[PDB]
Amino acid sequence: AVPAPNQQPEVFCNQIFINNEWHDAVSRKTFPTVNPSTGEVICQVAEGDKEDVDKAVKAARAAFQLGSPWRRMDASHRGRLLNRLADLIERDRTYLAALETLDNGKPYVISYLVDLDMVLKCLRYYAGWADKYHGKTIPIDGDFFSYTRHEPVGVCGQIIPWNFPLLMQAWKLGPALATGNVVVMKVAEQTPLTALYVANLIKEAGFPPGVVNIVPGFGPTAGAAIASHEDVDKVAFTGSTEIGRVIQVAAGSSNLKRVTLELGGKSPNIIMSDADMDWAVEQAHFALFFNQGQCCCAGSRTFVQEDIYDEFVERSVARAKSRVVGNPFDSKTEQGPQVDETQFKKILGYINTGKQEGAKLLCGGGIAADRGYFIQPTVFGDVQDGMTIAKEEIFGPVMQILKFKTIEEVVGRANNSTYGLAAAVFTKDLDKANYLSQALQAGTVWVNCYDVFGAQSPFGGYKMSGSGRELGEYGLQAYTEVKTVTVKVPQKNS
Amino acid sequence: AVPAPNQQPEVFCNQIFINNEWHDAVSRKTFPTVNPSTGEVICQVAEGDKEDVDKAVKAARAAFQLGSPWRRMDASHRGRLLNRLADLIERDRTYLAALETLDNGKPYVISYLVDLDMVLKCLRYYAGWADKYHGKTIPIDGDFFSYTRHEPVGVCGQIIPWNFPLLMQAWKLGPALATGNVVVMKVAEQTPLTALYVANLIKEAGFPPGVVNIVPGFGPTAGAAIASHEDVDKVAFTGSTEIGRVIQVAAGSSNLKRVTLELGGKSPNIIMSDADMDWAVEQAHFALFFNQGQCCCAGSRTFVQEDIYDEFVERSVARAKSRVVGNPFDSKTEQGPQVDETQFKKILGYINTGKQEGAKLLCGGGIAADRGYFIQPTVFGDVQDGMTIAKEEIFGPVMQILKFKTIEEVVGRANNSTYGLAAAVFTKDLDKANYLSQALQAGTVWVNCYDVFGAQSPFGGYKMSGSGRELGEYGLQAYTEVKTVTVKVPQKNS
Amino acid sequence: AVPAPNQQPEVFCNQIFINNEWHDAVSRKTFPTVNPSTGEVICQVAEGDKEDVDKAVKAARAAFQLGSPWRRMDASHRGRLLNRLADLIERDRTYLAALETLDNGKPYVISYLVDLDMVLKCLRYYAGWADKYHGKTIPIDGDFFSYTRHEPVGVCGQIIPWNFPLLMQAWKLGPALATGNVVVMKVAEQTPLTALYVANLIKEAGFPPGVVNIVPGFGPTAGAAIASHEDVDKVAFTGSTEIGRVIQVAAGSSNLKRVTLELGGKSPNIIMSDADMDWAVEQAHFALFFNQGQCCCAGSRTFVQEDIYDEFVERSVARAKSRVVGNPFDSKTEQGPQVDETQFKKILGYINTGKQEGAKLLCGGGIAADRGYFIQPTVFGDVQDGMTIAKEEIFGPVMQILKFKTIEEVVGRANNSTYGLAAAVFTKDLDKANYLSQALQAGTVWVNCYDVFGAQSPFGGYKMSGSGRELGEYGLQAYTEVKTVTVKVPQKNS
Amino acid sequence: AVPAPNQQPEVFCNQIFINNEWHDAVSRKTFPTVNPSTGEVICQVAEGDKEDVDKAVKAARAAFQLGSPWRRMDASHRGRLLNRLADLIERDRTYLAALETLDNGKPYVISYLVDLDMVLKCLRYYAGWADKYHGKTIPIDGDFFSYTRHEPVGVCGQIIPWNFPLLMQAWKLGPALATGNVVVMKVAEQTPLTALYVANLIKEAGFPPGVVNIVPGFGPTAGAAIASHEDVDKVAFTGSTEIGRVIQVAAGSSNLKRVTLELGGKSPNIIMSDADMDWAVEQAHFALFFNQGQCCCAGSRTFVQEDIYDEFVERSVARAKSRVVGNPFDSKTEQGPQVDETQFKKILGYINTGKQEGAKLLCGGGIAADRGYFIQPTVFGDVQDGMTIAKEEIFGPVMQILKFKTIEEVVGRANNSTYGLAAAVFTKDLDKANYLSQALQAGTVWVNCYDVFGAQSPFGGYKMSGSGRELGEYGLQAYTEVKTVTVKVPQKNS
Ligand SMILES: Cc1cc(Br)c2c(c1)C(=O)C(=O)N2
Ligand code: NA
Ligand code: NA
Ligand code: NA
Ligand code: NA
Structure with missing residues (x-):
């Protein structure tokens, strides 16, 4: 259609x-x-x-x-x-x-x-x-x-x-x-x-x-x-x-x-251990990479509970390596180019800081084509709150995955930012969803979804x-x- | 009581x-x-x-x-x-x-x-x-x-x-x-x-x-x-x-x-020719002199229709000349002192500017007591839109009375200001009241009253x-x- | 068009x-x-x-x-x-x-x-x-x-x-x-x-x-x-x-x-002595005769202050006489027929009772054509509250004109009804409008208009x-x- | 205190x-x-x-x-x-x-x-x-x-x-x-x-x-x-x-x-298998027995999922038997008498009806004293929808416990009633809570609570x-x- x-x-x-x-x-x-x-x-x-x-x-x-x-x-x-x-x-x-x-x-x-x-x-x-x-x-x-x-x-x-x-x-x-x-x-x-x-x-x-x-x-x-x-x-x-x-x-x-x-924004996408793995992985991919990451409320801080961290990282990496980059008029293309030279360089500069500060590059990282402002879907793992890529808005196809243990911990960390545009919570538990939706300092909180605008x-x-x-x-x-x-x-x- | x-x-x-x-x-x-x-x-x-x-x-x-x-x-x-x-x-x-x-x-x-x-x-x-x-x-x-x-x-x-x-x-x-x-x-x-x-x-x-x-x-x-x-x-x-x-x-x-x-503000109080004279006189007096003139929304531009101007002015002067200035703890006192030395002097300076730029001093215009910051109830007539006392917030017991002819005229003159806190309309006519409260660019428009806060x-x-x-x-x-x-x-x- | x-x-x-x-x-x-x-x-x-x-x-x-x-x-x-x-x-x-x-x-x-x-x-x-x-x-x-x-x-x-x-x-x-x-x-x-x-x-x-x-x-x-x-x-x-x-x-x-x-309803249309006369007459005509009088909110009790009663009545009757009754597809037609034979009879019966009980029949009064259910525009003057045509909903082209003296009178006379669908007030005075709009027991009160639906x-x-x-x-x-x-x-x- | x-x-x-x-x-x-x-x-x-x-x-x-x-x-x-x-x-x-x-x-x-x-x-x-x-x-x-x-x-x-x-x-x-x-x-x-x-x-x-x-x-x-x-x-x-x-x-x-x-009402209190058993048992007891069962929104139909039915019934019967019936002024008293003899008799009529139509009487079911209008806390198990005690308001301390299997089933059975004053849902799962709260035809739906009024x-x-x-x-x-x-x-x- x-x-x-x-x-x-x-x-x-x-x-x-x-x-x-x-x-x-x-x-x-x-x-x-x-x-x-x-x-x-x-x-x-x-x-x-x-x-x-x-x-x-x-x-x-x-x-x-x-x-x-x-x-x-x-x-x-x-x-x-x-x-x-x-x-x-x-x-x-x-x-x-x-x-x-x-x-x-x-x-x-x-x-x-x-x-x-x-x-x-x-x-x-x-x-x-x-x-x-x-x-x-x-x-x-x-x-x-x-x-x-x-x-x-x-x-x-x-x-x-x-x-x-x-x-x-x-x-x-x-x-x-x-x-x-x-x-x-x-x-x-x-x-x-x-x-x-x-x-x-x-x-x-x-x-x-x-x-x-x-x-x-x-x-x-x-x-x-x-x-x-x-x-x-x-x-x-x-x-x-x-x-x-x-x-x-x-x-x-x-x-x-x-x-x-x-x-x-530097919006936190929070994946609890009881979350639907497949749905969470696909939605967290969407949460970040939608519109070439050129999204104010892009889920740029993907917080994942330690019990499922490894599986989630491996699945996210696989999905990012499969994401089709190319001509935006091609019906198979999922990611087009960035908007201009300035943003292209800016993003590449942010990827450099990620590598410099010791975040684990898991895929992509570089240019995706000889012609046009194309950048490979990029994932960083073991990201720390203090890293530049965990603090500043990148506005590109660059994913940060972070590990957490407790619900008290992730609230404090998610809210530790001068931004608060959006946030998301993935979980099957009624109480966790309500506790987190209340506690997060965000203009929009999504529960088991992302980028749902009406x-x-x-x-x-x-x-x-x-x-x-x-x-x-x-x-x-x-x-x-x-x-x-x-x-x-x-x-x-x- | x-x-x-x-x-x-x-x-x-x-x-x-x-x-x-x-x-x-x-x-x-x-x-x-x-x-x-x-x-x-x-x-x-x-x-x-x-x-x-x-x-x-x-x-x-x-x-x-x-x-x-x-x-x-x-x-x-x-x-x-x-x-x-x-x-x-x-x-x-x-x-x-x-x-x-x-x-x-x-x-x-x-x-x-x-x-x-x-x-x-x-x-x-x-x-x-x-x-x-x-x-x-x-x-x-x-x-x-x-x-x-x-x-x-x-x-x-x-x-x-x-x-x-x-x-x-x-x-x-x-x-x-x-x-x-x-x-x-x-x-x-x-x-x-x-x-x-x-x-x-x-x-x-x-x-x-x-x-x-x-x-x-x-x-x-x-x-x-x-x-x-x-x-x-x-x-x-x-x-x-x-x-x-x-x-x-x-x-x-x-x-x-x-x-x-x-x-x-420099709020306009508009008196149409069909206004109840006694009510309008008293309310316009209150509108300006209330709280020693120290009101953001003080009726500091009293627009009066030319057919009733002279009578309104005479009545307004008599009310101002009778206003009891004195000790605020005395039950007969209508007007206490101004708040401090700076305002005392500032208001006197405006009074000076009013009679210097050609506005007609009708009563008061000087200091009211030899101790404290008491100023005489002051009333200017023949005030023109170009005058400083017509433009700037005096914040003292100083009245400006301006004359106008038509309803189209007074809307233009009343709105021609960088201020727009409040305004008032005095008229018995239904259409006049709706025409004005509609056309005046002010947060509050009082009709047949003034300084009514709820x-x-x-x-x-x-x-x-x-x-x-x-x-x-x-x-x-x-x-x-x-x-x-x-x-x-x-x-x-x- | x-x-x-x-x-x-x-x-x-x-x-x-x-x-x-x-x-x-x-x-x-x-x-x-x-x-x-x-x-x-x-x-x-x-x-x-x-x-x-x-x-x-x-x-x-x-x-x-x-x-x-x-x-x-x-x-x-x-x-x-x-x-x-x-x-x-x-x-x-x-x-x-x-x-x-x-x-x-x-x-x-x-x-x-x-x-x-x-x-x-x-x-x-x-x-x-x-x-x-x-x-x-x-x-x-x-x-x-x-x-x-x-x-x-x-x-x-x-x-x-x-x-x-x-x-x-x-x-x-x-x-x-x-x-x-x-x-x-x-x-x-x-x-x-x-x-x-x-x-x-x-x-x-x-x-x-x-x-x-x-x-x-x-x-x-x-x-x-x-x-x-x-x-x-x-x-x-x-x-x-x-x-x-x-x-x-x-x-x-x-x-x-x-x-x-x-x-x-038996809605009162109230004409104060200070209303616009030509406007009031045309709106009163409209208020009653619209849709062959077959409106639940029709102005079926027209209260006119005694100082303007004679003029209002003469004008309303002159307007009622010139009202064109006939084939509803003809462009000159202002008034069609009633909806069926039962209404045709009921309305004529109410007209009979108006004459009997001593209301002055000023124009119309009978059948308007030998084909279809067309009734003549009918006006009753000097109508009193106890009259059947003053109490009961006629739902036809039959006007009632009642005389009153004071604002207190008309409120009480208007409100003395088991009905309360609509009412109207015609006046140029701000306080009379506000007094009447508040006091009238009706779901809609129109001021200087009638049948204004949104x-x-x-x-x-x-x-x-x-x-x-x-x-x-x-x-x-x-x-x-x-x-x-x-x-x-x-x-x-x- | x-x-x-x-x-x-x-x-x-x-x-x-x-x-x-x-x-x-x-x-x-x-x-x-x-x-x-x-x-x-x-x-x-x-x-x-x-x-x-x-x-x-x-x-x-x-x-x-x-x-x-x-x-x-x-x-x-x-x-x-x-x-x-x-x-x-x-x-x-x-x-x-x-x-x-x-x-x-x-x-x-x-x-x-x-x-x-x-x-x-x-x-x-x-x-x-x-x-x-x-x-x-x-x-x-x-x-x-x-x-x-x-x-x-x-x-x-x-x-x-x-x-x-x-x-x-x-x-x-x-x-x-x-x-x-x-x-x-x-x-x-x-x-x-x-x-x-x-x-x-x-x-x-x-x-x-x-x-x-x-x-x-x-x-x-x-x-x-x-x-x-x-x-x-x-x-x-x-x-x-x-x-x-x-x-x-x-x-x-x-x-x-x-x-x-x-x-x-005949309000359904739905207990899903993933509910907190301790909380669900105490809340269902409260839902039914509060105020001698004389509450219009009493949880008079307790639906318990089949896997937890036997334990819930066992715990519910034990709690009913421990409920202290006595002098309402005595601090130990949980349950007073019914309001009057008419209700007293009616409740005994309903208890008899339950027994006659094949409901299993688990405890109580009789008169609890020789003076006043005290009725024993009564529990019926294996109640079916077509039973009168499952259909009609008893307004006494008589509990109905029904068994169900699927969430789709319980919706229909809960909604098959001419009443719809209230309902409740006990579950730890977000999706079940939202699905039931939406699907239940009731003016109030409580989730993991009952009789919460504000x-x-x-x-x-x-x-x-x-x-x-x-x-x-x-x-x-x-x-x-x-x-x-x-x-x-x-x-x-x-
Ligand atoms: C202002 C704005 C609008 C839309 Br649609 C968006 C965003 C921001 C996002 O961050 C996104 O993913 N979709
Ligand atoms: Na461009
Ligand atoms: Na003192
Ligand atoms: Na017909
Ligand atoms: Na009693």
């Missing part, structure tokens, strides 16, 4: 999107976006900078003015546009999945069945919320009638990463638009193409001009410009924990814009893995500004 | 409160707190600094450890302890009101009937939330059971101002303690005493050691230490917008602690008046960390 | 709908359904009875068995099917409007622009609710993890009236299907055809067999059979109060199935106008069975 | 409680209430009938009038009153516990530590809800502002049973008074004394006259008069399924008042065990009438 891909899809949108129009950058500068499987340039893209962001923000501010089409629009009709957008994305599903693989590197099978399926589900879910996020009527003391209005927060700056271009765009636009906000979105320079085509679909669906504006560009230029703009009411950022800090400083430095962050269930970080939540009802909170209206009445009665 | 005050209440607590015990500062250094009615010193207070804050955060962290009495305590019993603390405050109500007046300057009548009443109601409102802030069970796709846990955010740094010492303390501790957080509080140097006595009642109530820790001191020292601490999970700040920017920068530069801000009704700013909300159900949101638990199940059914 | 009607639409569906297939009655009996504009039979329809209801319930029970396609289906996919059903209704919108007008008699323009629009909005609203009606996780005392599942109530019997055949069908299916129930629906003998056609669309949309079953037939046989059935879990009935009482008794004397009722806002009776609510989040409550799960854990922590 | 009881406690209240005053019946009639431990009369109590109920309903209705102290009272203050009542009950705990034991028969240790504790927790829980049950503001289509008020349902009839007299009174009063309703309560003739004393405390707490009225008397007279009353808006009833039918019929037959029902977690029946839920937020739903107010506005914006 996967239709055939077009392995060289035409590029139709490569410009700045403001007011449902396509614009070259003010400076006329451009930048190349690259095909990571070949390393060849796909096409040139307009390089937005502050001046282009200023244009986007003004366009958005005007679309948001009291009495505008977007503000007067019925809430139900915002839901109707979101469903229309989703129908258009479904019409062009194969195209977009192929364009995603071309620009990102992830396998086309995964793009089609996972990424675009989740885009469609996210947009259709939030379509449903548009007219259901009620304010409150409140039994305040005295002769008063008091109630809340859930207004849009306003102009929302949204900076999205390269690991899931399409899906992250959906994750941001969905809540924003459902609650009647306007956006200025900065797409990642590595993967700008799918998001710009979606902008063309946003025009086709019938969204008023300026409601969604997209400005491709670099982090320190366009990203920073959105972060520090005096008329952006809210910023939402998914990227490194390092940059997250820069984003929050920029907001305090600028106009006290509201901030939410979805950052990195648009209905919130996702986000504890500690320095981020603040605020995306998905679910919770994802609407940061896109709402609460107004209390309190009216004197002649006589208050229950 | 007000009980006669003790006009010289004994001071019992004046040190640093950590682990239900009283500590001198590591440096052993103290600072004076002044009785603003006299300019004389009440007592010395321990000057807390970074190292004292570090001790408090350690005490908070230990009390928040999994397995501790506080973490294991039933949600319902947390409510009982909050209800117990409320009873203890009510028990000592006459004393606390007197001490509030002693150290802050506000009238004893107001301290007793307004301040302590709202303290009691806040604590009792939040006691009710302890066991009712439910997470969710979520109908996710696939064979999964998914639900959310609403956990405490953890160690909460709380910085409160000097204008409502006891009430601002209750606003912070209520929602923090109801949701099982631990607290490191920084009280203002000008008004530390009442907060510190409440610490004794917190211990007497039965709160475990370290759950509430209070460290008096300066803003640049103790305040900056909390906002920048590596192991504080959350900071809530109330104060000026200037300082709010520094807090958010400090959060971003340290450990990405979650931030909420309650800041200043624990059930959220409060907080638009724009640079803040982020987040206190009071109501909304107050618990910033003190909760959300954890999704997603469990594989044999077969999901509806 | 209304496309040209096929004025004699073909009837495709006229049987019993069970397991996505069409069935003759077990007895083979059929009954005629009439075109009320002519008095002639459109076609014969299968007369469902106890035996047929027994088969429909067994099919419903089978489709509801644990592990069935319907039970295992993702909540989000239930929503997709509802939106698909809506698209299919929208596809066949012109046909459905014409068929609705043929069987019911309402003008085709109203049928197209109002009834089908509201059908579409209702279904799309509840599609959104399918995967959002969360249960809770509950901070219970002791070492336990407690939560609630919101499960479907089960086999739902749904009995709909004839005044809004398609809309009332949507009002019932929307919430029931969103929450994953199964339905045995009984449609009105006077108007079964459109509901049976929608059953074809239900099959086409993709709903599993047995999820929706429809049994056209008589009230005392097919209706009572559902209401008394030992394996039906929940009954929703919309119709007369008298039969409402029969339904609640039948639930009680069988299996204690859950009951919700949408019953009649899928998002709940609708239902006080007193004997019904119990429970439909539409909004509230309309899901009656279709949910709450399950508590409480699980022993090792150690509960916040 | 249990204070020594007064074994012959004085009676202070034995009359009808209307308008905070004590009244004899209009007929001056009284009835004796019996001490089930001795079979001797305690005292006479006023016998309320139709005329007394009518007086009570008029007092309730008067207290509910617009502008009354109770309607005008701040929501937060209702909260305060409930908290005061709880403190007064706690003050008089020893007495109330002793009185409860004297009249009902249950162990004094249990009354004091369990019943009274739960009464305090229920009332304090609902105190917290008084000012937090918000209506909604709703984004409806068009130029309208729409919102819901949550008003009180009105005059609420409350009919409570004799098995938990104090607790059941709290479960009714809490949610009703929290939401501002007024109450006419009928207490059980077997156990009216503790409720009447609490009425004194309700007066002392400061609840306005008429808010709570109590009419002691008999079911067919006083009870029926409440259910049939034309000015009662709602009836909540707890008792037998049979009488529940009578109440629903009466409600439909009169004024369509709203009905919730809490009825009997004021926070709802309770109620599936099928014929009741409808509606008490406790938690859900307990408020039945005490709320929802009013939609939809207001036309000049220009709707988001």
